[PDB]
Write a protein that binds this ligand. Sequence first.
Ligand SMILES: *[C@@H]1O[C@H](CO)[C@@H](O[C@@H]2O[C@H](CO)[C@@H](O[C@@H]3O[C@H](CO[C@H]4O[C@H](CO)[C@@H](O)[C@H](O)[C@@H]4O)[C@@H](O)[C@H](O[C@H]4O[C@H](CO)[C@@H](O)[C@H](O)[C@@H]4O)[C@@H]3O)[C@H](O)[C@H]2NC(C)=O)[C@H](O)[C@H]1NC(C)=O
Ligand SMILES: *[C@@H]1O[C@H](CO)[C@@H](O[C@@H]2O[C@H](CO)[C@@H](O)[C@H](O)[C@H]2NC(C)=O)[C@H](O)[C@H]1NC(C)=O
Ligand SMILES: *[C@@H]1O[C@H](CO)[C@@H](O[C@@H]2O[C@H](CO)[C@@H](O)[C@H](O)[C@H]2NC(C)=O)[C@H](O)[C@H]1NC(C)=O
Ligand SMILES: *[C@@H]1O[C@H](CO)[C@@H](O[C@@H]2O[C@H](CO)[C@@H](O)[C@H](O)[C@H]2NC(C)=O)[C@H](O)[C@H]1NC(C)=O
Ligand SMILES: *[C@@H]1O[C@H](CO)[C@@H](O)[C@H](O)[C@H]1NC(C)=O
Ligand SMILES: *[C@@H]1O[C@H](CO)[C@@H](O)[C@H](O)[C@H]1NC(C)=O
Ligand SMILES: *[C@@H]1O[C@H](CO)[C@@H](O)[C@H](O)[C@H]1NC(C)=O
Ligand SMILES: *[C@@H]1O[C@H](CO)[C@@H](O)[C@H](O)[C@H]1NC(C)=O
Ligand SMILES: *[C@@H]1O[C@H](CO)[C@@H](O)[C@H](O)[C@H]1NC(C)=O
Ligand SMILES: *[C@@H]1O[C@H](CO)[C@@H](O)[C@H](O)[C@H]1NC(C)=O
Ligand SMILES: *[C@@H]1O[C@H](CO)[C@@H](O)[C@H](O)[C@H]1NC(C)=O
Ligand SMILES: *[C@@H]1O[C@H](CO)[C@@H](O)[C@H](O)[C@H]1NC(C)=O
Ligand SMILES: *[C@@H]1O[C@H](CO)[C@@H](O)[C@H](O)[C@H]1NC(C)=O
Ligand SMILES: *[C@@H]1O[C@H](CO)[C@@H](O)[C@H](O)[C@H]1NC(C)=O
Lengths: 123, 123, 123, 460, 52, 52
Amino acid sequence: LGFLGAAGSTMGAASMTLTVQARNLLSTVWGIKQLQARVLAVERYLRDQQLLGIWGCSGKLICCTNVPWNSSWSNRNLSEIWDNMTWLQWDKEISNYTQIIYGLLEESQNQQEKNEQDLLALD
Amino acid sequence: LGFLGAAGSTMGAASMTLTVQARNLLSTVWGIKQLQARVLAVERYLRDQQLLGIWGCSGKLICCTNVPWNSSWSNRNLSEIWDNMTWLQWDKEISNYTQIIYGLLEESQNQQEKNEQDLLALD
Amino acid sequence: LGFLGAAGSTMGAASMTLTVQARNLLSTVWGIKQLQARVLAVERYLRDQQLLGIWGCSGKLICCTNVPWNSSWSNRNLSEIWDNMTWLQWDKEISNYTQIIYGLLEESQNQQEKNEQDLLALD
Amino acid sequence: ENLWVTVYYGVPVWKEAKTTLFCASDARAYEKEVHNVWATHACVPTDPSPQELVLGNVTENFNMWKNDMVDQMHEDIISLWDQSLKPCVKLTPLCVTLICSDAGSGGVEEMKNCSFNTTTEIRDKEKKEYALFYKPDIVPLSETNNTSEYRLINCNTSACTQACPKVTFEPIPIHYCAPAGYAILKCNDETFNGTGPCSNVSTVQCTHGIRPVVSTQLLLNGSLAEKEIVIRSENLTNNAKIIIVHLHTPVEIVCTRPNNNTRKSVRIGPGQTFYATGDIIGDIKQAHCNISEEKWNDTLQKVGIELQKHFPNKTIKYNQSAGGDMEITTHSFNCGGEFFYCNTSNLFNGTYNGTYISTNSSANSTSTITLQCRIKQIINMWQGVGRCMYAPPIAGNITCRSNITGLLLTRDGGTNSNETETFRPAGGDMRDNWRSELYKYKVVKIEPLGVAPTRCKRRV
Amino acid sequence: NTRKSVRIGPGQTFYATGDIIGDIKQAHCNISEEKWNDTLQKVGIELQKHFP
Amino acid sequence: SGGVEEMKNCSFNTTTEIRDKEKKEYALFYKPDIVPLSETNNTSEYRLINCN
Ligand SMILES: *[C@@H]1O[C@H](CO)[C@@H](O[C@@H]2O[C@H](CO)[C@@H](O[C@@H]3O[C@H](CO[C@H]4O[C@H](CO)[C@@H](O)[C@H](O)[C@@H]4O)[C@@H](O)[C@H](O[C@H]4O[C@H](CO)[C@@H](O)[C@H](O)[C@@H]4O)[C@@H]3O)[C@H](O)[C@H]2NC(C)=O)[C@H](O)[C@H]1NC(C)=O
Ligand SMILES: *[C@@H]1O[C@H](CO)[C@@H](O[C@@H]2O[C@H](CO)[C@@H](O)[C@H](O)[C@H]2NC(C)=O)[C@H](O)[C@H]1NC(C)=O
Ligand SMILES: *[C@@H]1O[C@H](CO)[C@@H](O[C@@H]2O[C@H](CO)[C@@H](O)[C@H](O)[C@H]2NC(C)=O)[C@H](O)[C@H]1NC(C)=O
Ligand SMILES: *[C@@H]1O[C@H](CO)[C@@H](O[C@@H]2O[C@H](CO)[C@@H](O)[C@H](O)[C@H]2NC(C)=O)[C@H](O)[C@H]1NC(C)=O
Ligand SMILES: *[C@@H]1O[C@H](CO)[C@@H](O)[C@H](O)[C@H]1NC(C)=O
Ligand SMILES: *[C@@H]1O[C@H](CO)[C@@H](O)[C@H](O)[C@H]1NC(C)=O
Ligand SMILES: *[C@@H]1O[C@H](CO)[C@@H](O)[C@H](O)[C@H]1NC(C)=O
Ligand SMILES: *[C@@H]1O[C@H](CO)[C@@H](O)[C@H](O)[C@H]1NC(C)=O
Ligand SMILES: *[C@@H]1O[C@H](CO)[C@@H](O)[C@H](O)[C@H]1NC(C)=O
Ligand SMILES: *[C@@H]1O[C@H](CO)[C@@H](O)[C@H](O)[C@H]1NC(C)=O
Ligand SMILES: *[C@@H]1O[C@H](CO)[C@@H](O)[C@H](O)[C@H]1NC(C)=O
Ligand SMILES: *[C@@H]1O[C@H](CO)[C@@H](O)[C@H](O)[C@H]1NC(C)=O
Ligand SMILES: *[C@@H]1O[C@H](CO)[C@@H](O)[C@H](O)[C@H]1NC(C)=O
Ligand SMILES: *[C@@H]1O[C@H](CO)[C@@H](O)[C@H](O)[C@H]1NC(C)=O
């Protein structure tokens, strides 16, 4: 199994197949197009890894955080979200507020790590 | 806060805007300059991540090490240097004194890694 | 020491010089040749870092795993390897048996990954 | 009971986007010492195992009249054509007044002799040379009825560039691949009318082999259909949109020629030598194309029985192309480096009124359709931005035992109280060929980061 | 008048001036007087800050 | 028309689309574009200013 193996399946079934999806990220006139495509592939991989590495989730497929979830973003219960939707529509009504999600996660990571530095310097 | 949102603030105020400043290190006559700019931005960010990962601090915004601070570099206390001067003056003071700090960090990291290797091979 | 400072030296001095040999992996018609060399250099380093990242050794210069070492690959004593050899003929000895090593490391990290995955949601 | 944000790496979501694309040739074209006008060495070799994955329960919207891969293919082929003529002989000294007579004794009614003068190794002296030029390449500049003076046709607009006589125009297949971080959605529905939803979407990195053949009407070598004859069109209400007919079974076609002597090497400067047609040995016959009768008849009858779905209570007719110059109204292709332009009145002479007429005669296979047709040498394709090519001739006889796949029709402007809507053939822009090959594919961008609320909370 | 089109070489076109219709008049450029004068005087009063 | 005083007529011969034949054409070039070729005292063998 390779890319997008549960692209139309339910949301809860997608969590058990994440190990096989994020695998292939690096593997005249037809030289310049190849060079531009290679450069944008490197840029895409580095952007995704850097954005995963800011908020303390480097090298992990599933990462839990410590920011509360506001009810003004979804206003829907957990059961129908995790057993009814595909990822496509859920991305469609989160894409209006993903920037606020990213900013809150970044600030929560910085506060947590400053608390860790103060706790380590207490000793 | 913007890209350089705290450039004249103190150390205690500028240590909280790290996460909204590190986010923006990656994001025909005039169709080759853009390509050169893409490649040099990628090289700069990868050089920074290379320099951070060598002394064992990958994916950390603030890094606590075990290198003792020689007094000849600063000759100053801590409260006034964290609540009085900005990052630019302190960088201008320490800009002569950086390569020996980087070498000390590299030596201490390799010593710590060999010590941890010996301790884990003892078991 | 300098670049390639202990290439002919024994195994004991080779572990004290890993932190300097990772420095130099980064540092018209000829313009496209220069961009081709630069992009292949950055891509080779990025594939190397990703390959370190697959089997759970990202950032660390010396990484211990739990793959059992089959004796048919080497058939040599431990102190014979680490006190009477340089890296070169060791590489010529092991280089036939590299893909089995890489696959075993990858599957061991996959095993530890699903252990972490079903340990996170069992408390 | 509380909700916390959790990031996920590996979320399968898509965005519609455009990106630059690869070229993936095979190893079999990698070994030849000649370089064709496309690329063999420049394209990356492909793995001999196409990784195809089918999605579970997705339904995706598709369009093909607003696509980006078609425009990228068009720009790639235009740039390859304009790049494979840079280190070639520029025939700017071939603009002299030509003195032409009949083609020796026993005139051939195809060629003129057209002897000119040219510059030798000294700039001062001139020498008399003779050639053989085809009739469409020769235009009588005149102020009176002086029939002894003629000139070449491309010394009026631009260009005058000769093709390099070591490249080939053979259409080897090229694959398109998306870069890493992208994918291609491919629709496997057999009854795909061109636009709308599809329910068997598969995700593919590298597309199947595309042969970049050039043809105005009457599509040559290509991928067949799956089940039946399929009609593709943009609206089927106005008559300005070219309707593409895709066939299920192929019809054999051959096109041959009488003899020529050889390339006659004529030198026009320092190291610049062009190869015009020399003598002709043997007799003179007409170049032609041959198609089997009954295969063409029941193929057009199958197009008739399937084409009546959009026009239920009307009969359909065919006639010739609706006028213009010879370069548009005629079936044009290339074989072995020689460019054929052919009159297609004998193929589109018929009608269907709703009564299927089956045929059962195994001894009636001798009947064939012939097409009496001509050959140019000065080429002005892509209706502009072409860099007008002079294809050098080929010595021996040439045979083009081809295959046929599709038809490019159009509808005549109808009249009131009509039940006899006619369909003509038309050529036009060259986007229709690669649009009729790339109907399946759509390029798409994956976004592997997602956020979701759950009961998990990070430890402090 | 026009771009008269001379043809040179195998397909090169050179555009030149053809006839002239109407009379011949001179090509001028107009500046307002008092706006120029008081802008020049403002440059003058801002230029005496350096030279005493 | 005998009263232009800034543009000359400057008739010449030129190469047509056939490089064997030449034809007689005319223009109207501006006066600073043109310098006299001083092979004689005749003020009629003018030339373009970029030709050297
Ligand atoms: C649609 O699909 C068909 C099917 O492939 C294509 O038809 C092929 O067209 C190519 C050219 O476009 C043909 O290739 C030519 O074949 C000639 C005859 O080959 C016979 O003789 C040789 C020995 O001389 C045998 O080895 C061979 O097996 C055959 O028995 C050759 O004479 C040609 O060679 C010329 O080119 C080469 C390369 O530059 C030169 O080195 C030679 O000196 C010579 O000048 C050439 O190889 C091919 O035969 C056709 N296939 C068939 C089955 O007939 C159509 O082109 C394709 N497209 C269209 C638009 O119809
Ligand atoms: C085209 O004209 C040329 C001359 O203008 C012909 O070449 C002549 O061929 C005869 C053969 O009987 C020779 O005797 C002459 O010496 C040739 N004249 C030359 C080379 O200047 C040529 O044959 C004509 N083309 C054809 C197809 O007949
Ligand atoms: C030079 O090219 C022009 C087109 O740009 C020719 O003009 C027409 O050419 C067609 C094709 O032969 C003729 O049918 C028309 O009669 C031409 N004239 C017009 C007004 O459309 C032109 O003929 C070419 N020059 C010469 C000398 O033939
Ligand atoms: C090329 O020609 C121009 C045009 O005559 C020359 O320019 C004149 O040179 C003479 C001699 O030095 C001067 O007295 C004139 O003032 C120049 N200008 C004009 C408008 O006549 C020029 O010298 C020539 N040679 C070069 C450029 O090497
Ligand atoms: C149809 O979608 C559902 C999603 O709830 C999935 O469980 C099912 O397997 C899909 N059907 C097929 C045939 O895959
Ligand atoms: C071509 O060049 C020759 C060179 O001697 C000359 O005699 C002849 O008149 C020229 N023109 C034609 C039309 O042959
Ligand atoms: C989808 O296409 C694949 C291609 O092999 C085929 O096997 C499968 O049966 C198709 N499914 C449907 C529902 O058409
Ligand atoms: C083209 O199609 C659209 C909708 O499919 C329709 O509204 C429009 O009238 C059509 N064009 C013509 C000329 O009928
Ligand atoms: C085809 O077009 C010609 C053009 O005038 C017309 O006369 C004729 O009726 C049309 N139909 C047929 C079947 O020839
Ligand atoms: C094609 O053939 C028909 C009849 O055979 C003839 O009337 C016509 O002039 C020919 N040429 C074109 C360009 O249609
Ligand atoms: C078309 O076919 C008919 C009969 O098959 C024949 O009489 C006629 O000459 C053909 N050509 C045209 C142009 O009608
Ligand atoms: C024309 O070429 C084909 C190539 O297969 C050959 O079979 C045929 O005999 C040739 N024609 C003649 C008259 O030799
Ligand atoms: C065209 O049809 C013939 C007849 O089956 C077939 O052998 C040939 O392979 C087809 N052409 C191509 C390019 O596949
Ligand atoms: C220009 O060419 C024509 C004809 O070729 C000739 O009569 C004339 O003398 C030439 N020179 C000038 C200065 O007009």
